[PDB]
Design an enzyme around this catalytic site. Structure first.
Site, PDB file in Angstrom:
ATOM      1  CE  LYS A  14      -1.934  -1.472   3.776  1.00  0.00           C
ATOM      2  NZ  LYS A  14      -0.995  -2.884   3.724  1.00  0.00           N
ATOM      3  CB  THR A  15       3.432   2.335   2.199  1.00  0.00           C
ATOM      4  OG1 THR A  15       2.649   2.411   3.410  1.00  0.00           O
ATOM      5  CG2 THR A  15       4.389   3.646   2.508  1.00  0.00           C
ATOM      6  CG  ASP A  32       2.161   5.043   5.115  1.00  0.00           C
ATOM      7  OD1 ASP A  32       1.891   4.685   3.906  1.00  0.00           O
ATOM      8  OD2 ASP A  32       2.804   4.768   5.781  1.00  0.00           O
ATOM      9  CG  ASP A  33       0.596   2.111   9.067  1.00  0.00           C
ATOM     10  OD1 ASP A  33      -0.519   1.524   9.183  1.00  0.00           O
ATOM     11  OD2 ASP A  33       1.354   1.697   9.627  1.00  0.00           O
ATOM     12  CE  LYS A  58     -16.806  14.446   5.158  1.00  0.00           C
ATOM     13  NZ  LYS A  58     -18.117  14.540   5.620  1.00  0.00           N
ATOM     14  CE  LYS A  76       7.085  -3.973   5.278  1.00  0.00           C
ATOM     15  NZ  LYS A  76       6.425  -3.031   5.991  1.00  0.00           N
TER      16      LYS A  76
HETATM   17  N1  LIG Z   1     -29.544  22.488  -3.742  1.00  0.00           N
HETATM   18  C1  LIG Z   1     -28.245  22.609  -3.123  1.00  0.00           C
HETATM   19  N2  LIG Z   1     -28.041  22.126  -1.804  1.00  0.00           N
HETATM   20  C2  LIG Z   1     -27.092  22.019  -1.256  1.00  0.00           C
HETATM   21  N3  LIG Z   1     -26.056  22.201  -1.786  1.00  0.00           N
HETATM   22  C3  LIG Z   1     -25.839  22.462  -3.388  1.00  0.00           C
HETATM   23  C4  LIG Z   1     -27.180  22.481  -4.120  1.00  0.00           C
HETATM   24  N4  LIG Z   1     -26.863  22.493  -5.327  1.00  0.00           N
HETATM   25  C5  LIG Z   1     -25.548  22.484  -5.472  1.00  0.00           C
HETATM   26  N5  LIG Z   1     -24.948  22.492  -4.091  1.00  0.00           N
HETATM   27  C6  LIG Z   1     -23.514  22.026  -4.010  1.00  0.00           C
HETATM   28  O1  LIG Z   1     -23.334  20.892  -3.153  1.00  0.00           O
HETATM   29  C7  LIG Z   1     -22.197  21.210  -2.230  1.00  0.00           C
HETATM   30  C8  LIG Z   1     -22.908  20.661  -1.138  1.00  0.00           C
HETATM   31  O2  LIG Z   1     -22.052  20.319   0.025  1.00  0.00           O
HETATM   32  P1  LIG Z   1     -22.205  20.671   1.464  1.00  0.00           P
HETATM   33  O3  LIG Z   1     -20.835  20.622   2.087  1.00  0.00           O
HETATM   34  O4  LIG Z   1     -22.876  21.930   1.788  1.00  0.00           O
HETATM   35  O5  LIG Z   1     -22.783  19.295   1.791  1.00  0.00           O
HETATM   36  P2  LIG Z   1     -23.121  18.573   3.589  1.00  0.00           P
HETATM   37  O6  LIG Z   1     -24.502  17.595   3.589  1.00  0.00           O
HETATM   38  O7  LIG Z   1     -22.850  19.745   4.350  1.00  0.00           O
HETATM   39  O8  LIG Z   1     -21.745  17.532   3.524  1.00  0.00           O
HETATM   40  P3  LIG Z   1     -21.241  16.916   4.814  1.00  0.00           P
HETATM   41  O9  LIG Z   1     -22.170  15.812   5.041  1.00  0.00           O
HETATM   42  O10 LIG Z   1     -19.811  16.406   4.415  1.00  0.00           O
HETATM   43  O11 LIG Z   1     -21.174  17.805   5.913  1.00  0.00           O
HETATM   44  C9  LIG Z   1     -21.648  22.470  -2.449  1.00  0.00           C
HETATM   45  O12 LIG Z   1     -20.576  22.463  -3.187  1.00  0.00           O
HETATM   46  C10 LIG Z   1     -23.018  23.102  -2.857  1.00  0.00           C
HETATM   47  O13 LIG Z   1     -22.700  24.416  -3.412  1.00  0.00           O
HETATM   48  N1  LIG Z   2       3.978  -3.849  -7.238  1.00  0.00           N
HETATM   49  C1  LIG Z   2       4.450  -3.492  -5.911  1.00  0.00           C
HETATM   50  N2  LIG Z   2       3.716  -2.789  -5.192  1.00  0.00           N
HETATM   51  C2  LIG Z   2       3.873  -2.393  -4.059  1.00  0.00           C
HETATM   52  N3  LIG Z   2       5.121  -2.600  -3.344  1.00  0.00           N
HETATM   53  C3  LIG Z   2       5.990  -3.362  -4.174  1.00  0.00           C
HETATM   54  C4  LIG Z   2       5.700  -3.695  -5.430  1.00  0.00           C
HETATM   55  N4  LIG Z   2       6.830  -4.581  -6.193  1.00  0.00           N
HETATM   56  C5  LIG Z   2       7.531  -4.265  -5.042  1.00  0.00           C
HETATM   57  N5  LIG Z   2       7.303  -3.675  -3.989  1.00  0.00           N
HETATM   58  C6  LIG Z   2       8.225  -3.658  -2.902  1.00  0.00           C
HETATM   59  O1  LIG Z   2       7.587  -4.223  -1.758  1.00  0.00           O
HETATM   60  C7  LIG Z   2       7.579  -3.300  -0.529  1.00  0.00           C
HETATM   61  C8  LIG Z   2       6.036  -3.127  -0.236  1.00  0.00           C
HETATM   62  O2  LIG Z   2       6.087  -2.373   1.263  1.00  0.00           O
HETATM   63  P1  LIG Z   2       5.160  -1.496   1.782  1.00  0.00           P
HETATM   64  O3  LIG Z   2       5.734  -0.823   3.047  1.00  0.00           O
HETATM   65  O4  LIG Z   2       4.629  -0.515   0.835  1.00  0.00           O
HETATM   66  O5  LIG Z   2       3.804  -2.361   2.173  1.00  0.00           O
HETATM   67  P2  LIG Z   2       2.515  -2.080   2.896  1.00  0.00           P
HETATM   68  O6  LIG Z   2       1.244  -2.884   2.682  1.00  0.00           O
HETATM   69  O7  LIG Z   2       2.459  -0.545   3.138  1.00  0.00           O
HETATM   70  O8  LIG Z   2       3.088  -2.540   4.417  1.00  0.00           O
HETATM   71  P3  LIG Z   2       2.270  -2.474   5.960  1.00  0.00           P
HETATM   72  O9  LIG Z   2       0.988  -3.251   6.024  1.00  0.00           O
HETATM   73  O10 LIG Z   2       3.351  -2.875   6.713  1.00  0.00           O
HETATM   74  O11 LIG Z   2       1.962  -0.931   5.752  1.00  0.00           O
HETATM   75  C9  LIG Z   2       8.356  -2.216  -0.721  1.00  0.00           C
HETATM   76  O12 LIG Z   2       9.735  -2.589  -0.564  1.00  0.00           O
HETATM   77  C10 LIG Z   2       8.164  -2.114  -2.330  1.00  0.00           C
HETATM   78  O13 LIG Z   2       9.069  -1.376  -3.076  1.00  0.00           O
HETATM   79 MG   LIG Z   3       2.386   0.648   4.921  1.00  0.00          MG
END
Ligand SMILES: Nc1ncnc2c1ncn2[C@@H]1O[C@H](COP(=O)(O)OP(=O)(O)OP(=O)(O)O)[C@@H](O)[C@H]1O
Ligand SMILES: Nc1ncnc2c1ncn2[C@@H]1O[C@H](COP(=O)(O)OP(=O)(O)OP(=O)(O)O)[C@@H](O)[C@H]1O
Ligand SMILES: [Mg+2]
Ligand SMILES: Nc1ncnc2c1ncn2[C@@H]1O[C@H](COP(=O)(O)OP(=O)(O)OP(=O)(O)O)[C@@H](O)[C@H]1O
Ligand SMILES: Nc1ncnc2c1ncn2[C@@H]1O[C@H](COP(=O)(O)OP(=O)(O)OP(=O)(O)O)[C@@H](O)[C@H]1O
Ligand SMILES: Nc1ncnc2c1ncn2[C@@H]1O[C@H](COP(=O)(O)OP(=O)(O)OP(=O)(O)O)[C@@H](O)[C@H]1O
Ligand SMILES: Nc1ncnc2c1ncn2[C@@H]1O[C@H](COP(=O)(O)OP(=O)(O)OP(=O)(O)O)[C@@H](O)[C@H]1O
Ligand SMILES: [Mg+2]
Ligand SMILES: [Mg+2]
Ligand SMILES: [Mg+2]
Ligand SMILES: [Mg+2]
Ligand SMILES: [Mg+2]
Lengths: 247, 247, 247, 247, 247, 247
Positions: D61-62, D115-116, D143, D220
């Site tokens: 993942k990392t 990360d992690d 957010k 890994k």
């Molecule tokens: N009718 C509408 N009512 C509300 N937001 C709207 C509407 N039309 C467009 N939008 C757009 O959608 C987005 C709404 O996101 P907002 O952050 O208000 O949602 P939220 O329910 O408060 O989110 P969260 O659950 O993450 O708190 C904004 O970008 C807003 O401008």
């Molecule tokens: N396709 C690949 N994707 C990811 N890592 C790869 C790949 N091929 C080789 N590697 C090597 O494998 C290792 C991956 O370990 P890494 O720390 O990214 O794993 P992780 O899932 O993040 O670990 P942890 O669960 O401990 O957080 C690194 O040494 C990376 O270079």
């Molecule tokens: Mg990792």
């Protein structure tokens, strides 16, 4: 600050309405207390003696503990009360409590009243929650003998013997004295007479309703019910009293 | 402050009413203790030896631990007691406890008594709650060998072996010694005789009621019941004693 | 303070009674350890290697970990031990632990022993309770590769593999090595012989009681039982030994 | 300190063993990542985009998150890693984390890798326990849109998607990308080939045992098993490898 | 710092993608809000009015609350947002929150938006855990009338009405306004049209799949799915959109 | 700062919409309060009297408590309110609360209102959680008699009598007074008449729907529903009112 190794308590605030002999248990409590005072003053084997006065709330535990202490005539008599530790942190209470015992140890004969243990320990049944630091300090203080040759009588009071038992505090106290509520119509009538608030006609009416019967009320609680009854028009005082006593 | 690498304890406060041989277990406890002292002083393999004296409350654990320590004749003998840490925070207790062991390590032969482990750890069964920092410090101290060549005998006492087991502390102690309550009428009569408080007629009466029977009372508790009995009029001392022993 | 990027440990305190070959598992532990040392020094793919030595309490985990470390001949060898963090707060332990790894990173080849993980983490099964800050620091340190090109072998020890698994620490260790208690009468007899405490007649008696049979005791525990047995009169040493081994 | 509104990460430490194409999922992860980079750079509607790379531990993942970030070619690329917050209190982590985002906001195009997540939040399943202050800071940061007109791609990694879901963190991420372990004998053989550690004869033997079969191991983890296998005598490397892979 | 008793909010950051009339509920929310603004400005009986906008996550609660506030044309309009209290301790949040209300009280007509109550209170369902100090401050602030004659409209938003009910916060709000997700294919098509991202042919395809059907997606979430769909090759945008909408 | 031993409260903020006689319970509450004021001023036996006004939320508890206090005509009248302790730590609240009682003790006749006990104690049913330090301070203050000869009437208010009972606070109060919601159509019509908001035709319509029927709404809540109804066009005010009252 009193003289070295001495302390005179203000019993007026802890016994504001006296100590009336409403029944045999009152005499029993005072007599058992005097025996413990006697043991403390005369014994070399048990120079530290502790007793817990316990019973239902409002039964008169504090006033009786203060009376037992007063009758000891010891040079050092101090009452450790929660109303002097309001808002105190655990540490603050332990320091205050430890100070009292430290001063007591300076006297050849001392008596310390640890009043209302539940409040001192900040106990609440929800959780429950309480100050363990204070509990631990008290468990140790209850078993710490004053410096060689000096005597100490510790008198605790509580309305929650059950909680203290769970906390292992009963193993710390040498013995316990039960402080009961007024339990019979006779004891109730005796209390009213000694307090002298109702007229014979009224006491007669009350008697008809309580004599040869059982009741359950603490002397402190009784004082309040009476006083509330006295605010009614003369013709309704008794009615009010019995109603309050009823519910 | 004592001489470098030395310390003489005040055994009078921990053994205020002596060590009477009321029964075989008393001798067994002292003998097992002397064997552990012997092992500590003579062994190169196990220079650190720890033992937990445990039994019911009031059975005489502390006085016996203090006696075993006293009989070791070690240059450094120190008793770590909770009545010297009243109100202490976890850190404060660990520092105080760590100081004692640090000083012990300076002696070729040392003995440290960790008394009343439950109080040192601020234990309470409600929760339960306790000071883990202190528990951890103790678990490590119980296994830390003094600097090469030097010996240390650690003697702990507790009325709650069960709690210490749950805390994994039993795996830390080398061994344990059970400190029982007086358990037979014979042992009870022997105690009364060695303490010499009742007249033959009285002991005879008591004997009629307890001989060939089983009882369960700690020596410390027995001392209190006797002393309470002695406050009665001569003609009622025995009655009082048996009543107290009964309930 | 040692030379930059170096550190020589005092193995005497962690292996006070040597490393006797009482059975095949001892050789297996040392051999597996040397293979991990080999991998650490020679690999570019896995420059960070960690291994957890685990088994029942008193089985010899620490001494074996210290021996594996000693045999690595690495320039930097350090043992992170709880007896150097007594009374330490979570932060204090993390700083102390982090310092050790920081110094290790300065060497081309380093080995760090994280001994008695349960104590380092202030673990107690009641609750349970433990220092999460320390656990988190350890989980990260177990996966942090030294600066490019440098190698590090981390060796942990524990008597509670189960707890570490729940804490997700097993996913952090590269592998684990089981450190078993002595399990057969043969292994037990071999230990006694290598330690040389009983006479042939005595070992013969013991053998009659344990040969071809199964036992379960850690080498550290065995040392204590032997030493306790040696305090008895010659004629009762064996009796004592078998009794102790029995219960 | 880098130039205002810029930051170049050291990808070598997060991708020490490259990114081998052992199977289709590797390409899928990188392609999905580039699409999110594209969306972030080109969109006015969603200037803030977040993605969680999640899968079993050791699946890569990392390194994959670091690779996606590297391929974005953004002026500001920073990896928020727990190995830079060892021993940190909740507040300290929040300040450190908040600093990174604050610097990112100064760039027109930025990418932050959190990360992690489990370690950043000090999570442990026993309790469970975790830093809520850090969780809350992260929920808000996920957010918080950069100042008008500027873009930010947040890439998180975790081995515990389930825990993050319970914490309501999945509602914060725009989307998620699964990072799987190697799952087939074919993928396993491809990995070994690309890593080039075994001889054809050896890979043939392994193939006979894994081809057309299913396996479950993170890249890994595979690296470690291989390296451990290579410490064996030539004639036993394969045996060791399959044994390790087996259990 | 704005003029005494005044404050102009930056609505651009809270309504970055406008307020489109995708369905009747949008108009209902705005109309109910204007009625509450009317009541606040004109009433002497209820000079303090509070309303909680609640619904599923991403439904548009914050933007709608900000729009209602903006349309009030009050001299003092302030939005209490968690992204301005990142890493804040309970006390710090209470002080910051209390400051806002203190400034509002200085205006004859004020409107305060307490946005994302769950984040302000540091809520997490595991435990659960939350800042009670902040909850208590909010419960009191919701019922504290501005100084005589002055009016205040408090608008809260949350995605967890259920949690707030358990916390007794619903008894504090005067009323609540439900903010629903887009629920029908018609409303979904209307949104796409007003946002203008797909071609008629595409909307036709989508329509065939959603018209006369039910859906459940928040406007904020819809914006993200669209934007993700737009990264695909023209020929696959619709396929991607429906797939995302599907799962 | 007021004159020594005195304090005049601002009843306008606690009774902003008067005290209308919508039903017999209003008179009952005021009469019971005056009797307690009478008892406090005239009694030597019970110089400390405490009463808890309790009922459902919004029933008018605070205004009625403030009215009872106002009618006492005592030299010292103070209302301990949570809106003056926003964000306060436990200690801060205890100090503030203790200050009020300290000042009250300086007057021969004082009345202290401890308003909204649940908020003062930072109570929340989730957990539950609350400030035990504040609870303990209140339990002690409720039983602390002013200095000899001086009187004190303590009036508490709460919407959670059940919680206070669990906290053992009911044993602290001398008595309690129930403050009910409007419960009958008649009482509801009386309230509307005394408030004078609807026309006879409208009240007639409402009457047809509520007369001879049962309702359950607090006077404070009724004020809000009315005011919300008044924002509708004349022809829909009644419809709105009944709808709001309905759900
Ligand atoms: N009718 C509408 N009512 C509300 N937001 C709207 C509407 N039309 C467009 N939008 C757009 O959608 C987005 C709404 O996101 P907002 O952050 O208000 O949602 P939220 O329910 O408060 O989110 P969260 O659950 O993450 O708190 C904004 O970008 C807003 O401008
Ligand atoms: N396709 C690949 N994707 C990811 N890592 C790869 C790949 N091929 C080789 N590697 C090597 O494998 C290792 C991956 O370990 P890494 O720390 O990214 O794993 P992780 O899932 O993040 O670990 P942890 O669960 O401990 O957080 C690194 O040494 C990376 O270079
Ligand atoms: Mg990792
Ligand atoms: N025989 C008596 N025993 C005790 N108190 C008495 C007696 N006769 C009269 N009183 C009076 O009754 C009151 C007893 O109240 P006190 O505070 O001692 O009770 P309590 O049980 O300690 O109360 P709480 O349960 O609140 O702690 C005092 O005013 C005391 O003077
Ligand atoms: N054989 C004996 N063993 C122990 N104590 C004895 C013996 N004979 C007399 N005593 C006296 O009995 C008392 C024992 O009390 P001690 O404080 O030692 O008991 P404990 O079990 O440690 O108490 P606790 O359970 O309270 O910790 C001391 O006064 C001691 O001198
Ligand atoms: N083969 C062996 N392996 C390990 N220790 C041995 C061996 N032979 C002798 N010993 C000795 O036994 C003791 C082992 O104790 P050690 O402290 O290492 O055990 P442990 O399992 O780590 O203990 P704990 O469970 O208390 O942590 C040391 O004195 C060591 O020198
Ligand atoms: N008879 C009455 N009793 C009480 N309040 C009344 C009465 N008639 C009118 N009112 C008005 O109703 C309002 C009562 O609200 P108040 O804050 O006292 O209620 P509460 O029950 O204390 O509220 P909460 O449950 O929120 O603590 C005040 O505006 C008060 O003036
Ligand atoms: Mg009392
Ligand atoms: Mg003891
Ligand atoms: Mg070890
Ligand atoms: Mg929002
Ligand atoms: Mg109120």
């Amino acid at each position: 600050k009193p003289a070295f190794g001495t302390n005179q308590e203000d019993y007026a605030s802890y016994i504001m309405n006296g100590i009336i002999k409403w029944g045999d248990p009152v005499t029993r409590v005072l007599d058992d207390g005097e025996l413990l005072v006697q043991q403390t003053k005369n014994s070399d084997r048990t120079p530290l003696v502790s007793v817990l006065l316990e019973g239902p709330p409002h039964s008169g535990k504090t006033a009786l503990a203060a009376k037992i202490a007063e009758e000891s005539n010891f040079p050092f008599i101090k009452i450790c009360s929660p109303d002097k530790m309001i808002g105190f942190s655990e540490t603050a209470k332990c320091q205050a409590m430890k100070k009292i015992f430290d001063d007591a140890y300076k006297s050849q004969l001392s008596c310390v009243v640890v009043d209302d243990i539940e409040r001192l320990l900040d106990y609440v049944p929800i959780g429950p929650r309480f100050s363990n630091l204070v509990l631990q300090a008290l468990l140790v203080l209850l078993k710490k003998a004053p410096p060689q040759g000096r005597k100490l009588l510790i008198i605790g009071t509580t309305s929650r013997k059950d909680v203290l038992q769970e906390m292992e505090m009963l193993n710390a106290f040498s013995t316990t004295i039960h402080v009961p509520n007024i339990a019979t119509g006779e004891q109730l009538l005796e209390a009213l007479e000694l307090l002298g608030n109702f007229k014979d006609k009224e006491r007669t009416t009350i008697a008809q309703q309580v004599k040869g019967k059982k009741v359950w009320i603490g002397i402190k609680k009784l004082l309040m019910l009476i006083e509330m009854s006295l605010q009614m028009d003369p013709e309704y005082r008794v009615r009010k009293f019995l109603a309050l006593l009823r519910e």
